[PDB]
From Swiss-Prot:
Its cofactor is Fe(2+); Zn(2+). It comes from the Bacteria. Fe cation binds at C90, H132, H136. GO terms for cellular component: cytosol. The keyword GTP-binding does not apply. Keywords: Hydrolase, Iron, Metal-binding, Protein biosynthesis, Zinc. One of its GO terms (biological process) is co-translational protein modification. This is Peptide deformylase. Belongs to the polypeptide deformylase family. GO terms for molecular function: ferrous iron binding; hydrolase activity; peptide deformylase activity; ribosome binding; zinc ion binding. SUPFAM superfamilies: Peptide deformylase (SSF56420). It is an enzyme of class 3 (hydrolase). The gene is def. It comes from Escherichia coli (strain K12).
Length: 165
């Protein structure tokens, strides 16, 4: 099922997700509905906070063929290095993009859809996406790295887009 994605300035986007206690059938259904939502909204990542599920669950697919499902449940950053940035967008900040500073490379550990622990070293786009999604789980949005003026402008633009419906 396609779930509703929250848009700024919704305060639910600022909530800190709790760790998933056990990866059971219910959590698998949430992961599957998150992928269906992410692909329906044409995105490359989605954090459960964005669909009002306040648990540490992230789905990502940065592949060209849209057939490489990455699940991060209870992710933890182990190492990072370098700096980079691209003009990021966000399904919760429709049609707005901005360059934000990110680590170039990261190493994380997390649980997959079967509840199995794994480690992943990422660079390039994947590293940026993992950082963006992990920020959503602690109530942080990419606009938070921008100047207060730019945050104001981005919020005003999104409210206008939504008003027009
Ligand atoms: Co986002």
């Amino acid at each position: 099922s396609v779930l509703q994605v929250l848009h700024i300035p919704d305060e639910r986007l600022r909530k800190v997700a709790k760790p998933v206690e056990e990866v059971n059938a219910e959590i698998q259904r949430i992961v599957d509905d998150m992928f269906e939502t992410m692909y329906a909204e044409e995105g490359i990542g989605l954090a459960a906070t964005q669909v009002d599920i306040h648990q540490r669950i992230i789905v990502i697919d940065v592949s060209e063929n849209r057939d490489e499902r990455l699940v991060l449940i209870n992710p933890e950053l182990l190492e990072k290095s370098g700096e980079t940035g691209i003009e990021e967008g966000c399904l919760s900040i429709p049609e707005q993009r901005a360059l934000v500073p990110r680590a170039e490379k990261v190493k994380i550990r997390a649980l997959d859809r079967d509840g199995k622990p794994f480690e992943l070293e990422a660079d390039g786009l994947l590293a940026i996406c993992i950082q963006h999604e992990m920020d959503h789980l602690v109530g942080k949005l990419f606009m938070d790295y921008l100047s207060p003026l730019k945050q104001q402008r981005i919020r005003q633009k999104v409210e206008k887009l939504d008003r027009l419906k």
